[PDB]
Amino acid sequence: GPVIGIDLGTTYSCVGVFKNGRVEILNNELGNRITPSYVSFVDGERKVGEAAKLEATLHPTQTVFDVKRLIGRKFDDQEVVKDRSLLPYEIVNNQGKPNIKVQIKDKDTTFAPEQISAMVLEKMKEIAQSFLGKPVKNAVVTVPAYFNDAQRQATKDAGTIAGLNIVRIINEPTAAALAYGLDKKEETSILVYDLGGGTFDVSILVIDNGVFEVYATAGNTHLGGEDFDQRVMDYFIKMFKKKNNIDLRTDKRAIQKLRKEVEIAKRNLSVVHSTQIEIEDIVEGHNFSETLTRAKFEELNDDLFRETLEPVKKVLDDAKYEKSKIDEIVLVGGSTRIPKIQQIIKEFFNGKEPNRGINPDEAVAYGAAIQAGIILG
Ligand SMILES: Nc1ncnc2c1nc(NCc1ccccc1Cl)n2[C@@H]1O[C@H](CO)[C@@H](O)[C@H]1O
Numbered sequence: 001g002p003v004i005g006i007d008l009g010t011t012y013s014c015v016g017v018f019k020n021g022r023v024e025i026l027n028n029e030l031g032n033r034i035t036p037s038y039v040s041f042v043d044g045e046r047k048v049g050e051a052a053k054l055e056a057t058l059h060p061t062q063t064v065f066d067v068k069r070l071i072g073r074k075f076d077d078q079e080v081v082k083d084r085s086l087l088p089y090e091i092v093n094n095q096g097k098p099n100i101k102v103q104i105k106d107k108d109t110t111f112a113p114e115q116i117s118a119m120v121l122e123k124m125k126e127i128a129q130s131f132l133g134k135p136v137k138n139a140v141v142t143v144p145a146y147f148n149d150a151q152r153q154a155t156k157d158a159g160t161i162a163g164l165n166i167v168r169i170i171n172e173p174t175a176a177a178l179a180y181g182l183d184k185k186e187e188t189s190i191l192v193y194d195l196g197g198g199t200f201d202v203s204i205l206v207i208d209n210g211v212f213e214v215y216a217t218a219g220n221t222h223l224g225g226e227d228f229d230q231r232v233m234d235y236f237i238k239m240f241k242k243k244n245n246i247d248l249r250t251d252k253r254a255i256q257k258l259r260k261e262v263e264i265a266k267r268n269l270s271v272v273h274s275t276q277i278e279i280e281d282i283v284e285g286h287n288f289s290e291t292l293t294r295a296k297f298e299e300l301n302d303d304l305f306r307e308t309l310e311p312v313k314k315v316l317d318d319a320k321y322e323k324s325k326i327d328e329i330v331l332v333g334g335s336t337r338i339p340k341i342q343q344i345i346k347e348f349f350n351g352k353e354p355n356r357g358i359n360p361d362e363a364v365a366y367g368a369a370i371q372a373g374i375i376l377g
Pocket of ligand 1: 034196197198224225226263266267268270333334335336337338361
């Protein structure tokens with residue numbers, strides 16, 4: 001049978017197949033190559049992906065996301081205590097482990113993290129199955145290099161619930177090395193800098209005659225593209241209050257519309273220098289119309305950009321590496337498209353150019369699909 005490759009991400013997932021000698025990253029029913037890792041439980045219906053994410057504004061307690069932060073952990077872990085205080089859906093203690101509690105037709109229903117991840121894996125599986133016109137029973141799935149045996153086992157259990165035999169778990173740095181086709185002969189020391197929507201990871205991966213080993217890993221579980229958006233939102237909410245005496249935080253729908261346009265403005269500012277953020281009637285009778293420059297975008301976030309270097313220094317220290325010991329810097333995650341990020345990394349490595357792909361959000365799923373093709377022979 002076929003083996004598909006799945007990047008089961010914190011904020012999004014991505015599925016790839018290896019077919020007639022090529023990796024195809026598959027579109028979901030809405031024509032997107034990434035699917036928000038969201039599940040909503042509203043009004044008797046269960047939604048997965050973008051339709052679930054759209055429920056978050058009006059139904060925040062019923063809209064489950066970021067489950068990768070909880071999977072295989074214990075309720076009293078310091079990281080889980082912090083996430084319970086940040087997440088708006090209820091998390092309960094089931095025999096020492098965090099479970100998610102929501103309502104289905106008003107009834108309390110409790111899910112293990114792996115049961116929510118299984119629903120994401122199931123949607124990825126169905127995209128594969130319709131594209132291939134065939135049942136899919138087998139997958140390669142990625143995990144962070146820092147995942148322990150309990151986090152990896154709960155990811156495998158999510159696969160089993162979704163009807164997927166996870167034939168191989170590979171770490172995200174290895175998946176990236178496979179996608180960029182890093183030559184497997186002789187020895188190479190690679191820095192994998194992975195800046196996503198919600199999380200920052202950096203690893204030293206060494207490739208030695210086809211054997212991949214992560215020698216050190218560090219990161220920031222609360223640093224990603226969504227934080228850069230929030231810095232911009234905070235700025236424009238303050239400006240709109242100064243000019244119009246309207247605090248947009250008093251209207252959750254206004255906030256949702258602004259957040260969509262701010263996200264789009266950020267992405268544009270990876271290519272242009274100036275972009276317009278426009279919402280007609282952001283509240284009734286008031287239009288939102290502003291210009292954001294790349295220079296103001298960077299000024300609002302420059303402390304967060306520079307914080308990404310603290311994990312880089314830590315993995316170099318943990319591995320006892322000199323900066324020069326790094327042979328190649330590889331960039332993963334759409335947030336590495338930010339010009340200032342690529343500049344800061346270049347300068348930290350006393351001038352060495354980072355390798356970035358063209359589709360940095362799909363690189364991990366691409367590599368998982370390559371690993372699937374390697375296993376099939
Ligand atoms: N040009 C960009 N400049 C800065 N940050 C970016 C850019 N593209 C993405 N991502 C790709 C993506 C997002 C939405 C729709 C389609 C795609 Cl393929 N990011 C950021 O990467 C993170 C995970 O997508 C998000 O925080 C996102 O905002």
